[PDB]
Amino acid sequence: GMDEKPAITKIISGGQTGADRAALDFAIKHHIPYGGWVPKGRLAEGGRVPETYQLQEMPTSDYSKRTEKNVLDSDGTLIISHGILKGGSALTEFFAEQYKKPCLHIDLDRISIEDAATLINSWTVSHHIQVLNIAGPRAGKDPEIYQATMDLLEVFLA
């Protein structure tokens, strides 16, 4: 029923700039537990993911392998973009599809943040998603994705 709320016990991401980084900053701001797999060496656009973020390194520096691991080590994956998925974000969706993990792609060129938050609520509650992987483009590909992600999560969980 509508009395039930999402039970997000943990947010994870791959530490990249953009959507991944907003997810972690949001979790920290709202004292939601967080984590995530990053490449060996904590590699990211813009340099080593800052040490203040408690994250786990993969055995190799490969981006694709850490994206795959975050899909596998969560209850579902939320992908946030402006426009159709490309690159790492499209790969995220492919991995979720291949491993039968719940996956919701919010395209913030097609839906408002308020309406998207409603969709995320319905999806998380109906699929009992508690450990949520959040993915999307790096900041160098979309200068608006970090703040859009923050703003979306605020409507969803704040």
Side-chain angles (χ1 to χ4, degrees), residues 1-2 4 6-85 87-99 101-158:
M2 291 186 291
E4 186 173 3
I8 305 303
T9 61
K10 192 179 185 168
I11 289 167
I12 72 169
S13 80
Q16 185 56 287
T17 61
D20 283 0
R21 199 71 60 82
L24 301 179
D25 288 341
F26 180 80
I28 291 165
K29 180 177 166 195
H30 295 272
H31 200 70
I32 300 172
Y34 73 88
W37 293 98
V38 297
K40 189 184 72 170
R42 314 171 64 88
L43 307 179
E45 177 181 71
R48 188 179 173 85
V49 178
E51 296 281 15
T52 46
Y53 299 98
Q54 302 301 297
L55 305 168
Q56 300 72 55
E57 289 179 47
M58 296 285 287
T60 79
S61 58
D62 192 67
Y63 278 156
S64 292
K65 290 172 183 175
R66 73 86 157 74
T67 297
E68 183 183 35
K69 191 79 178 182
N70 292 320
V71 169
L72 285 166
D73 204 11
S74 54
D75 293 331
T77 296
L78 169 61
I79 311 175
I80 309 165
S81 72
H82 297 107
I84 60 104
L85 300 184
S89 298
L91 186 59
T92 302
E93 183 179 61
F94 171 82
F95 287 137
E97 282 164 0
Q98 299 283 307
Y99 293 121
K101 287 280 181 189
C103 184
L104 176 58
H105 171 209
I106 295 300
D107 180 348
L108 289 177
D109 286 351
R110 301 268 65 85
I111 191 170
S112 67
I113 60 171
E114 297 89 351
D115 299 333
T118 296
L119 270 39
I120 302 166
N121 177 285
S122 294
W123 170 77
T124 55
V125 171
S126 68
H127 292 88
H128 292 270
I129 290 160
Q130 297 190 355
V131 179
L132 177 62
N133 179 40
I134 303 178
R138 67 186 163 85
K141 283 283 183 175
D142 182 355
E144 295 180 338
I145 199 62
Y146 175 92
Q147 194 58 49
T149 296
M150 299 288 290
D151 291 346
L152 176 57
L153 294 174
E154 289 282 341
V155 178
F156 169 49
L157 289 172

mmCIF file of all heavy atoms in Angstrom, residues 78-129, unseen atoms left out:
data_model
loop_
_atom_site.group_PDB
_atom_site.id
_atom_site.type_symbol
_atom_site.label_atom_id
_atom_site.label_comp_id
_atom_site.label_asym_id
_atom_site.label_seq_id
_atom_site.Cartn_x
_atom_site.Cartn_y
_atom_site.Cartn_z
ATOM 1 N N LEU A 78 19.950 1.830 -10.587
ATOM 2 C CA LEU A 78 19.292 3.024 -11.080
ATOM 3 C C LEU A 78 20.314 3.726 -11.983
ATOM 4 O O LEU A 78 21.411 4.026 -11.503
ATOM 5 C CB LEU A 78 18.905 3.944 -9.927
ATOM 6 C CG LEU A 78 18.423 5.360 -10.274
ATOM 7 C CD1 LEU A 78 17.136 5.314 -11.138
ATOM 8 C CD2 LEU A 78 18.147 6.138 -8.986
ATOM 9 N N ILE A 79 19.975 3.997 -13.251
ATOM 10 C CA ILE A 79 20.873 4.669 -14.209
ATOM 11 C C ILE A 79 20.232 6.032 -14.531
ATOM 12 O O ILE A 79 19.089 6.084 -14.941
ATOM 13 C CB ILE A 79 21.111 3.872 -15.521
ATOM 14 C CG1 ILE A 79 21.494 2.411 -15.193
ATOM 15 C CG2 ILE A 79 22.213 4.573 -16.317
ATOM 16 C CD1 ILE A 79 21.637 1.478 -16.398
ATOM 17 N N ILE A 80 20.963 7.112 -14.318
ATOM 18 C CA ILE A 80 20.468 8.462 -14.538
ATOM 19 C C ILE A 80 21.270 9.108 -15.682
ATOM 20 O O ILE A 80 22.488 9.122 -15.635
ATOM 21 C CB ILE A 80 20.599 9.293 -13.240
ATOM 22 C CG1 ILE A 80 19.978 8.559 -12.049
ATOM 23 C CG2 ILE A 80 19.956 10.683 -13.466
ATOM 24 C CD1 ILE A 80 20.377 9.126 -10.658
ATOM 25 N N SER A 81 20.581 9.709 -16.662
ATOM 26 C CA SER A 81 21.216 10.378 -17.779
ATOM 27 C C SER A 81 20.364 11.522 -18.282
ATOM 28 O O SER A 81 19.206 11.690 -17.874
ATOM 29 C CB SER A 81 21.414 9.409 -18.945
ATOM 30 O OG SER A 81 20.201 9.102 -19.578
ATOM 31 N N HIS A 82 20.961 12.264 -19.201
ATOM 32 C CA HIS A 82 20.243 13.129 -20.141
ATOM 33 C C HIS A 82 20.428 12.560 -21.515
ATOM 34 O O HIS A 82 21.541 12.602 -22.053
ATOM 35 C CB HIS A 82 20.726 14.584 -20.081
ATOM 36 C CG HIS A 82 20.502 15.251 -18.758
ATOM 37 N ND1 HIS A 82 21.538 15.522 -17.889
ATOM 38 C CD2 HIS A 82 19.372 15.705 -18.157
ATOM 39 C CE1 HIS A 82 21.054 16.134 -16.820
ATOM 40 N NE2 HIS A 82 19.738 16.239 -16.944
ATOM 41 N N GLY A 83 19.384 11.931 -22.040
ATOM 42 C CA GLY A 83 19.440 11.296 -23.345
ATOM 43 C C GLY A 83 19.674 9.784 -23.278
ATOM 44 O O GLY A 83 19.842 9.187 -22.200
ATOM 45 N N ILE A 84 19.716 9.166 -24.452
ATOM 46 C CA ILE A 84 19.914 7.726 -24.562
ATOM 47 C C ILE A 84 21.255 7.333 -23.989
ATOM 48 O O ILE A 84 22.249 8.069 -24.078
ATOM 49 C CB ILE A 84 19.773 7.250 -26.019
ATOM 50 C CG1 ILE A 84 20.810 7.937 -26.907
ATOM 51 C CG2 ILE A 84 18.309 7.475 -26.453
ATOM 52 C CD1 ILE A 84 21.979 7.052 -27.289
ATOM 53 N N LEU A 85 21.281 6.157 -23.359
ATOM 54 C CA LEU A 85 22.525 5.627 -22.799
ATOM 55 C C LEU A 85 23.587 5.303 -23.845
ATOM 56 O O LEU A 85 23.283 4.680 -24.859
ATOM 57 C CB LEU A 85 22.242 4.391 -21.979
ATOM 58 C CG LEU A 85 21.290 4.579 -20.795
ATOM 59 C CD1 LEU A 85 21.111 3.341 -19.964
ATOM 60 C CD2 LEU A 85 21.747 5.770 -19.916
ATOM 61 N N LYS A 86 24.810 5.702 -23.528
ATOM 62 C CA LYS A 86 26.009 5.383 -24.313
ATOM 63 C C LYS A 86 27.115 4.939 -23.378
ATOM 64 O O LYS A 86 27.026 5.111 -22.147
ATOM 65 C CB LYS A 86 26.475 6.616 -25.094
ATOM 66 C CG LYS A 86 25.483 7.084 -26.149
ATOM 67 N N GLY A 87 28.159 4.337 -23.935
ATOM 68 C CA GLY A 87 29.353 4.113 -23.162
ATOM 69 C C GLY A 87 29.104 3.293 -21.897
ATOM 70 O O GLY A 87 28.349 2.306 -21.949
ATOM 71 N N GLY A 88 29.757 3.672 -20.806
ATOM 72 C CA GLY A 88 29.700 2.909 -19.566
ATOM 73 C C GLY A 88 28.288 2.745 -19.020
ATOM 74 O O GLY A 88 27.981 1.729 -18.406
ATOM 75 N N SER A 89 27.459 3.777 -19.203
ATOM 76 C CA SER A 89 26.079 3.714 -18.728
ATOM 77 C C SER A 89 25.274 2.674 -19.506
ATOM 78 O O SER A 89 24.466 1.968 -18.927
ATOM 79 C CB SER A 89 25.411 5.088 -18.789
ATOM 80 O OG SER A 89 26.071 6.019 -17.939
ATOM 81 N N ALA A 90 25.483 2.598 -20.829
ATOM 82 C CA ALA A 90 24.815 1.577 -21.633
ATOM 83 C C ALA A 90 25.292 0.168 -21.230
ATOM 84 O O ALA A 90 24.502 -0.774 -21.221
ATOM 85 C CB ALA A 90 25.035 1.819 -23.130
ATOM 86 N N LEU A 91 26.583 0.050 -20.929
ATOM 87 C CA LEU A 91 27.178 -1.231 -20.479
ATOM 88 C C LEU A 91 26.560 -1.634 -19.148
ATOM 89 O O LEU A 91 26.281 -2.810 -18.920
ATOM 90 C CB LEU A 91 28.681 -1.088 -20.292
ATOM 91 C CG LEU A 91 29.433 -2.378 -19.969
ATOM 92 C CD1 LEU A 91 29.256 -3.442 -21.062
ATOM 93 C CD2 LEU A 91 30.915 -2.049 -19.690
ATOM 94 N N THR A 92 26.363 -0.658 -18.262
ATOM 95 C CA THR A 92 25.714 -0.940 -16.964
ATOM 96 C C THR A 92 24.377 -1.641 -17.194
ATOM 97 O O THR A 92 24.063 -2.619 -16.559
ATOM 98 C CB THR A 92 25.526 0.357 -16.140
ATOM 99 O OG1 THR A 92 26.784 0.980 -15.920
ATOM 100 C CG2 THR A 92 24.809 0.113 -14.825
ATOM 101 N N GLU A 93 23.560 -1.038 -18.059
ATOM 102 C CA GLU A 93 22.242 -1.561 -18.395
ATOM 103 C C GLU A 93 22.342 -2.979 -18.995
ATOM 104 O O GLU A 93 21.552 -3.859 -18.663
ATOM 105 C CB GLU A 93 21.522 -0.579 -19.361
ATOM 106 C CG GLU A 93 20.115 -0.994 -19.705
ATOM 107 C CD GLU A 93 19.432 0.000 -20.639
ATOM 108 O OE1 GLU A 93 19.960 0.165 -21.749
ATOM 109 O OE2 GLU A 93 18.408 0.579 -20.222
ATOM 110 N N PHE A 94 23.303 -3.168 -19.899
ATOM 111 C CA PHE A 94 23.555 -4.488 -20.491
ATOM 112 C C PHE A 94 23.847 -5.502 -19.383
ATOM 113 O O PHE A 94 23.292 -6.619 -19.397
ATOM 114 C CB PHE A 94 24.736 -4.404 -21.485
ATOM 115 C CG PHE A 94 25.227 -5.745 -21.982
ATOM 116 C CD1 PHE A 94 24.563 -6.371 -23.007
ATOM 117 C CD2 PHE A 94 26.303 -6.382 -21.392
ATOM 118 C CE1 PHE A 94 24.983 -7.609 -23.479
ATOM 119 C CE2 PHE A 94 26.713 -7.617 -21.851
ATOM 120 C CZ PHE A 94 26.046 -8.214 -22.895
ATOM 121 N N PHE A 95 24.737 -5.176 -18.445
ATOM 122 C CA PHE A 95 25.074 -6.128 -17.375
ATOM 123 C C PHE A 95 23.835 -6.437 -16.505
ATOM 124 O O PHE A 95 23.589 -7.591 -16.133
ATOM 125 C CB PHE A 95 26.191 -5.604 -16.463
ATOM 126 C CG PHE A 95 27.584 -5.596 -17.075
ATOM 127 C CD1 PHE A 95 28.420 -4.494 -16.893
ATOM 128 C CD2 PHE A 95 28.079 -6.696 -17.748
ATOM 129 C CE1 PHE A 95 29.694 -4.503 -17.397
ATOM 130 C CE2 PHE A 95 29.383 -6.690 -18.274
ATOM 131 C CZ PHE A 95 30.165 -5.564 -18.082
ATOM 132 N N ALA A 96 23.071 -5.403 -16.131
ATOM 133 C CA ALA A 96 21.864 -5.658 -15.362
ATOM 134 C C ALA A 96 20.892 -6.623 -16.091
ATOM 135 O O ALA A 96 20.337 -7.546 -15.483
ATOM 136 C CB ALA A 96 21.169 -4.332 -14.958
ATOM 137 N N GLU A 97 20.701 -6.378 -17.389
ATOM 138 C CA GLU A 97 19.862 -7.250 -18.241
ATOM 139 C C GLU A 97 20.378 -8.694 -18.270
ATOM 140 O O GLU A 97 19.594 -9.654 -18.135
ATOM 141 C CB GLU A 97 19.789 -6.714 -19.681
ATOM 142 C CG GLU A 97 18.810 -5.528 -19.858
ATOM 143 C CD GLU A 97 19.003 -4.729 -21.172
ATOM 144 O OE1 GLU A 97 19.893 -5.060 -21.990
ATOM 145 O OE2 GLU A 97 18.252 -3.746 -21.362
ATOM 146 N N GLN A 98 21.685 -8.855 -18.429
ATOM 147 C CA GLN A 98 22.283 -10.195 -18.552
ATOM 148 C C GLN A 98 22.281 -11.000 -17.234
ATOM 149 O O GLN A 98 22.229 -12.244 -17.261
ATOM 150 C CB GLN A 98 23.708 -10.117 -19.136
ATOM 151 C CG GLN A 98 23.794 -9.518 -20.550
ATOM 152 C CD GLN A 98 23.357 -10.484 -21.654
ATOM 153 O OE1 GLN A 98 23.846 -11.601 -21.740
ATOM 154 N NE2 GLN A 98 22.459 -10.031 -22.514
ATOM 155 N N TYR A 99 22.342 -10.300 -16.100
ATOM 156 C CA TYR A 99 22.341 -10.928 -14.791
ATOM 157 C C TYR A 99 20.956 -10.891 -14.131
ATOM 158 O O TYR A 99 20.819 -11.262 -12.974
ATOM 159 C CB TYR A 99 23.403 -10.269 -13.891
ATOM 160 C CG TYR A 99 24.807 -10.519 -14.336
ATOM 161 C CD1 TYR A 99 25.670 -9.468 -14.664
ATOM 162 C CD2 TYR A 99 25.293 -11.836 -14.419
ATOM 163 C CE1 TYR A 99 26.987 -9.719 -15.067
ATOM 164 C CE2 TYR A 99 26.578 -12.094 -14.811
ATOM 165 C CZ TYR A 99 27.427 -11.038 -15.132
ATOM 166 O OH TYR A 99 28.717 -11.333 -15.514
ATOM 167 N N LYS A 100 19.954 -10.388 -14.841
ATOM 168 C CA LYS A 100 18.571 -10.336 -14.347
ATOM 169 C C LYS A 100 18.411 -9.533 -13.065
ATOM 170 O O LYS A 100 17.633 -9.873 -12.158
ATOM 171 C CB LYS A 100 17.963 -11.752 -14.202
ATOM 172 C CG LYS A 100 18.094 -12.591 -15.478
ATOM 173 C CD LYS A 100 17.452 -11.940 -16.665
ATOM 174 N N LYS A 101 19.147 -8.430 -12.993
ATOM 175 C CA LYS A 101 19.048 -7.505 -11.871
ATOM 176 C C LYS A 101 18.047 -6.429 -12.230
ATOM 177 O O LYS A 101 18.084 -5.899 -13.352
ATOM 178 C CB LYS A 101 20.413 -6.872 -11.568
ATOM 179 C CG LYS A 101 21.421 -7.816 -10.894
ATOM 180 C CD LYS A 101 21.109 -7.902 -9.378
ATOM 181 C CE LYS A 101 22.032 -8.757 -8.629
ATOM 182 N NZ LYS A 101 21.485 -8.917 -7.291
ATOM 183 N N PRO A 102 17.146 -6.041 -11.311
ATOM 184 C CA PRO A 102 16.263 -4.936 -11.577
ATOM 185 C C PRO A 102 17.052 -3.714 -11.991
ATOM 186 O O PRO A 102 18.109 -3.408 -11.427
ATOM 187 C CB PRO A 102 15.535 -4.717 -10.238
ATOM 188 C CG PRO A 102 15.616 -6.048 -9.545
ATOM 189 C CD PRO A 102 16.900 -6.661 -9.997
ATOM 190 N N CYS A 103 16.539 -3.005 -12.967
ATOM 191 C CA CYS A 103 17.225 -1.870 -13.553
ATOM 192 C C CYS A 103 16.183 -0.835 -14.021
ATOM 193 O O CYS A 103 15.211 -1.192 -14.675
ATOM 194 C CB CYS A 103 18.139 -2.351 -14.674
ATOM 195 S SG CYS A 103 19.158 -1.012 -15.418
ATOM 196 N N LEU A 104 16.367 0.411 -13.613
ATOM 197 C CA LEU A 104 15.555 1.511 -14.039
ATOM 198 C C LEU A 104 16.442 2.570 -14.596
ATOM 199 O O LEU A 104 17.317 3.067 -13.897
ATOM 200 C CB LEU A 104 14.739 2.044 -12.844
ATOM 201 C CG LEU A 104 13.869 3.283 -13.093
ATOM 202 C CD1 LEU A 104 12.845 3.049 -14.206
ATOM 203 C CD2 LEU A 104 13.167 3.745 -11.803
ATOM 204 N N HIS A 105 16.204 2.979 -15.828
ATOM 205 C CA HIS A 105 16.879 4.094 -16.444
ATOM 206 C C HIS A 105 15.931 5.304 -16.445
ATOM 207 O O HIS A 105 14.873 5.236 -17.056
ATOM 208 C CB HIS A 105 17.245 3.774 -17.920
ATOM 209 C CG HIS A 105 17.756 4.970 -18.680
ATOM 210 N ND1 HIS A 105 17.602 5.131 -20.042
ATOM 211 C CD2 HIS A 105 18.453 6.055 -18.241
ATOM 212 C CE1 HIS A 105 18.147 6.287 -20.404
ATOM 213 N NE2 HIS A 105 18.689 6.853 -19.340
ATOM 214 N N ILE A 106 16.360 6.362 -15.760
ATOM 215 C CA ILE A 106 15.708 7.668 -15.766
ATOM 216 C C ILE A 106 16.464 8.564 -16.740
ATOM 217 O O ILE A 106 17.623 8.900 -16.515
ATOM 218 C CB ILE A 106 15.669 8.285 -14.368
ATOM 219 C CG1 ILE A 106 14.803 7.445 -13.440
ATOM 220 C CG2 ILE A 106 15.183 9.749 -14.398
ATOM 221 C CD1 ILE A 106 13.293 7.270 -13.872
ATOM 222 N N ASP A 107 15.775 9.011 -17.793
ATOM 223 C CA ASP A 107 16.292 9.951 -18.774
ATOM 224 C C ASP A 107 15.660 11.321 -18.420
ATOM 225 O O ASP A 107 14.492 11.569 -18.682
ATOM 226 C CB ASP A 107 15.940 9.502 -20.194
ATOM 227 C CG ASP A 107 16.445 10.449 -21.256
ATOM 228 O OD1 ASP A 107 16.888 11.586 -20.940
ATOM 229 O OD2 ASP A 107 16.452 10.062 -22.443
ATOM 230 N N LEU A 108 16.465 12.186 -17.812
ATOM 231 C CA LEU A 108 16.002 13.475 -17.325
ATOM 232 C C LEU A 108 15.835 14.488 -18.434
ATOM 233 O O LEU A 108 15.463 15.624 -18.138
ATOM 234 C CB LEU A 108 16.920 13.981 -16.199
ATOM 235 C CG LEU A 108 16.815 13.222 -14.894
ATOM 236 C CD1 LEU A 108 17.828 13.752 -13.879
ATOM 237 C CD2 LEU A 108 15.423 13.228 -14.293
ATOM 238 N N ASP A 109 16.018 14.080 -19.695
ATOM 239 C CA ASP A 109 15.475 14.872 -20.817
ATOM 240 C C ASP A 109 14.022 14.515 -21.164
ATOM 241 O O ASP A 109 13.377 15.247 -21.932
ATOM 242 C CB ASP A 109 16.317 14.735 -22.090
ATOM 243 C CG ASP A 109 17.627 15.489 -22.035
ATOM 244 O OD1 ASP A 109 17.885 16.292 -21.100
ATOM 245 O OD2 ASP A 109 18.456 15.286 -22.968
ATOM 246 N N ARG A 110 13.528 13.394 -20.634
ATOM 247 C CA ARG A 110 12.212 12.889 -21.003
ATOM 248 C C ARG A 110 11.199 12.970 -19.876
ATOM 249 O O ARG A 110 9.993 12.933 -20.131
ATOM 250 C CB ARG A 110 12.315 11.429 -21.465
ATOM 251 C CG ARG A 110 13.237 11.211 -22.654
ATOM 252 C CD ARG A 110 12.560 11.274 -23.974
ATOM 253 N NE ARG A 110 12.016 12.596 -24.274
ATOM 254 C CZ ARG A 110 12.700 13.611 -24.815
ATOM 255 N NH1 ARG A 110 13.988 13.486 -25.151
ATOM 256 N NH2 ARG A 110 12.081 14.774 -25.024
ATOM 257 N N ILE A 111 11.676 13.059 -18.639
ATOM 258 C CA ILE A 111 10.803 13.064 -17.456
ATOM 259 C C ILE A 111 11.336 14.123 -16.493
ATOM 260 O O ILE A 111 12.554 14.255 -16.326
ATOM 261 C CB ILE A 111 10.773 11.635 -16.816
ATOM 262 C CG1 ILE A 111 9.677 11.538 -15.763
ATOM 263 C CG2 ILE A 111 12.132 11.200 -16.313
ATOM 264 C CD1 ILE A 111 9.441 10.066 -15.275
ATOM 265 N N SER A 112 10.440 14.787 -15.770
ATOM 266 C CA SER A 112 10.876 15.731 -14.734
ATOM 267 C C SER A 112 11.444 15.012 -13.507
ATOM 268 O O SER A 112 11.149 13.875 -13.263
ATOM 269 C CB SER A 112 9.697 16.610 -14.317
ATOM 270 O OG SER A 112 8.713 15.826 -13.642
ATOM 271 N N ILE A 113 12.276 15.695 -12.717
ATOM 272 C CA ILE A 113 12.811 15.053 -11.520
ATOM 273 C C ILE A 113 11.695 14.647 -10.547
ATOM 274 O O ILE A 113 11.800 13.607 -9.890
ATOM 275 C CB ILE A 113 13.922 15.862 -10.775
ATOM 276 C CG1 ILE A 113 13.405 17.234 -10.318
ATOM 277 C CG2 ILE A 113 15.204 15.961 -11.661
ATOM 278 C CD1 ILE A 113 14.351 17.992 -9.399
ATOM 279 N N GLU A 114 10.635 15.450 -10.443
ATOM 280 C CA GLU A 114 9.570 15.088 -9.515
ATOM 281 C C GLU A 114 8.886 13.807 -9.933
ATOM 282 O O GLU A 114 8.594 12.958 -9.106
ATOM 283 C CB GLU A 114 8.538 16.206 -9.421
ATOM 284 C CG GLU A 114 9.092 17.511 -8.860
ATOM 285 C CD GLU A 114 9.673 18.454 -9.926
ATOM 286 O OE1 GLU A 114 9.828 18.076 -11.092
ATOM 287 O OE2 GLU A 114 9.968 19.642 -9.579
ATOM 288 N N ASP A 115 8.578 13.672 -11.191
ATOM 289 C CA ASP A 115 7.861 12.469 -11.690
ATOM 290 C C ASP A 115 8.796 11.240 -11.664
ATOM 291 O O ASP A 115 8.385 10.111 -11.355
ATOM 292 C CB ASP A 115 7.282 12.763 -13.074
ATOM 293 C CG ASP A 115 6.247 13.934 -13.053
ATOM 294 O OD1 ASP A 115 5.632 14.142 -12.026
ATOM 295 O OD2 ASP A 115 6.019 14.508 -14.086
ATOM 296 N N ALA A 116 10.061 11.468 -11.993
ATOM 297 C CA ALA A 116 11.046 10.409 -11.893
ATOM 298 C C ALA A 116 11.132 9.845 -10.476
ATOM 299 O O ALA A 116 11.293 8.643 -10.287
ATOM 300 C CB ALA A 116 12.452 10.889 -12.351
ATOM 301 N N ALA A 117 11.114 10.732 -9.480
ATOM 302 C CA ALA A 117 11.184 10.285 -8.076
ATOM 303 C C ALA A 117 10.036 9.323 -7.767
ATOM 304 O O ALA A 117 10.236 8.312 -7.080
ATOM 305 C CB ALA A 117 11.160 11.489 -7.125
ATOM 306 N N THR A 118 8.848 9.630 -8.288
ATOM 307 C CA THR A 118 7.683 8.721 -8.131
ATOM 308 C C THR A 118 7.962 7.353 -8.740
ATOM 309 O O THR A 118 7.707 6.291 -8.126
ATOM 310 C CB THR A 118 6.453 9.327 -8.711
ATOM 311 O OG1 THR A 118 6.161 10.503 -7.951
ATOM 312 C CG2 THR A 118 5.216 8.359 -8.680
ATOM 313 N N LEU A 119 8.490 7.348 -9.960
ATOM 314 C CA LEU A 119 8.863 6.088 -10.597
ATOM 315 C C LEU A 119 9.892 5.282 -9.802
ATOM 316 O O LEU A 119 9.812 4.049 -9.730
ATOM 317 C CB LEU A 119 9.365 6.289 -12.038
ATOM 318 C CG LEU A 119 8.349 6.236 -13.177
ATOM 319 C CD1 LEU A 119 7.011 6.875 -12.926
ATOM 320 C CD2 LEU A 119 8.972 6.712 -14.496
ATOM 321 N N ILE A 120 10.923 5.955 -9.288
ATOM 322 C CA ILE A 120 11.948 5.287 -8.508
ATOM 323 C C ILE A 120 11.334 4.692 -7.222
ATOM 324 O O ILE A 120 11.683 3.590 -6.793
ATOM 325 C CB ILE A 120 13.147 6.240 -8.180
ATOM 326 C CG1 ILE A 120 13.785 6.801 -9.461
ATOM 327 C CG2 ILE A 120 14.197 5.493 -7.305
ATOM 328 C CD1 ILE A 120 14.732 7.983 -9.239
ATOM 329 N N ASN A 121 10.457 5.438 -6.600
ATOM 330 C CA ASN A 121 9.765 4.927 -5.402
ATOM 331 C C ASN A 121 8.982 3.642 -5.739
ATOM 332 O O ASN A 121 9.062 2.648 -5.001
ATOM 333 C CB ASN A 121 8.882 6.039 -4.827
ATOM 334 C CG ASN A 121 8.078 5.614 -3.633
ATOM 335 O OD1 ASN A 121 7.092 4.893 -3.784
ATOM 336 N ND2 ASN A 121 8.448 6.103 -2.458
ATOM 337 N N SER A 122 8.192 3.652 -6.803
ATOM 338 C CA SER A 122 7.400 2.487 -7.158
ATOM 339 C C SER A 122 8.324 1.280 -7.441
ATOM 340 O O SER A 122 8.074 0.139 -7.013
ATOM 341 C CB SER A 122 6.572 2.831 -8.387
ATOM 342 O OG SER A 122 5.613 3.834 -8.080
ATOM 343 N N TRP A 123 9.432 1.531 -8.148
ATOM 344 C CA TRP A 123 10.329 0.483 -8.567
ATOM 345 C C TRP A 123 11.088 -0.118 -7.373
ATOM 346 O O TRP A 123 11.245 -1.328 -7.238
ATOM 347 C CB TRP A 123 11.303 1.045 -9.637
ATOM 348 C CG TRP A 123 12.477 0.180 -10.032
ATOM 349 C CD1 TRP A 123 12.461 -0.890 -10.851
ATOM 350 C CD2 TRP A 123 13.830 0.393 -9.662
ATOM 351 N NE1 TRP A 123 13.736 -1.390 -11.005
ATOM 352 C CE2 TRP A 123 14.599 -0.599 -10.282
ATOM 353 C CE3 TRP A 123 14.476 1.352 -8.878
ATOM 354 C CZ2 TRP A 123 15.964 -0.686 -10.117
ATOM 355 C CZ3 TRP A 123 15.852 1.276 -8.725
ATOM 356 C CH2 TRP A 123 16.566 0.244 -9.313
ATOM 357 N N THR A 124 11.656 0.758 -6.546
ATOM 358 C CA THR A 124 12.421 0.269 -5.365
ATOM 359 C C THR A 124 11.523 -0.513 -4.427
ATOM 360 O O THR A 124 11.897 -1.585 -3.923
ATOM 361 C CB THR A 124 13.158 1.392 -4.584
ATOM 362 O OG1 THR A 124 12.248 2.421 -4.199
ATOM 363 C CG2 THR A 124 14.324 1.942 -5.379
ATOM 364 N N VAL A 125 10.335 -0.003 -4.133
ATOM 365 C CA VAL A 125 9.461 -0.684 -3.149
ATOM 366 C C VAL A 125 8.970 -2.014 -3.738
ATOM 367 O O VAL A 125 8.992 -3.060 -3.072
ATOM 368 C CB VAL A 125 8.283 0.189 -2.708
ATOM 369 C CG1 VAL A 125 7.248 -0.655 -1.840
ATOM 370 C CG2 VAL A 125 8.813 1.396 -1.959
ATOM 371 N N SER A 126 8.514 -1.986 -4.992
ATOM 372 C CA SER A 126 7.938 -3.192 -5.586
ATOM 373 C C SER A 126 8.965 -4.298 -5.782
ATOM 374 O O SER A 126 8.600 -5.491 -5.729
ATOM 375 C CB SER A 126 7.158 -2.863 -6.855
ATOM 376 O OG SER A 126 7.972 -2.428 -7.889
ATOM 377 N N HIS A 127 10.234 -3.929 -5.998
ATOM 378 C CA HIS A 127 11.303 -4.906 -6.171
ATOM 379 C C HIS A 127 12.137 -5.195 -4.898
ATOM 380 O O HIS A 127 13.135 -5.913 -4.939
ATOM 381 C CB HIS A 127 12.217 -4.470 -7.323
ATOM 382 C CG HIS A 127 11.564 -4.539 -8.661
ATOM 383 N ND1 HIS A 127 10.847 -3.488 -9.177
ATOM 384 C CD2 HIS A 127 11.460 -5.548 -9.555
ATOM 385 C CE1 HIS A 127 10.351 -3.832 -10.357
ATOM 386 N NE2 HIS A 127 10.711 -5.075 -10.612
ATOM 387 N N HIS A 128 11.690 -4.624 -3.780
ATOM 388 C CA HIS A 128 12.367 -4.743 -2.479
ATOM 389 C C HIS A 128 13.853 -4.403 -2.539
ATOM 390 O O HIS A 128 14.681 -5.076 -1.919
ATOM 391 C CB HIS A 128 12.119 -6.115 -1.841
ATOM 392 C CG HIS A 128 10.707 -6.309 -1.419
ATOM 393 N ND1 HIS A 128 10.254 -5.964 -0.166
ATOM 394 C CD2 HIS A 128 9.653 -6.837 -2.075
ATOM 395 C CE1 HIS A 128 8.968 -6.243 -0.077
ATOM 396 N NE2 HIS A 128 8.576 -6.773 -1.222
ATOM 397 N N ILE A 129 14.180 -3.333 -3.265
ATOM 398 C CA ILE A 129 15.557 -2.916 -3.444
ATOM 399 C C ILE A 129 15.986 -2.165 -2.199
ATOM 400 O O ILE A 129 15.404 -1.135 -1.865
ATOM 401 C CB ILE A 129 15.686 -2.034 -4.680
ATOM 402 C CG1 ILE A 129 15.482 -2.912 -5.921
ATOM 403 C CG2 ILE A 129 17.104 -1.349 -4.708
ATOM 404 C CD1 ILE A 129 15.109 -2.136 -7.163
#
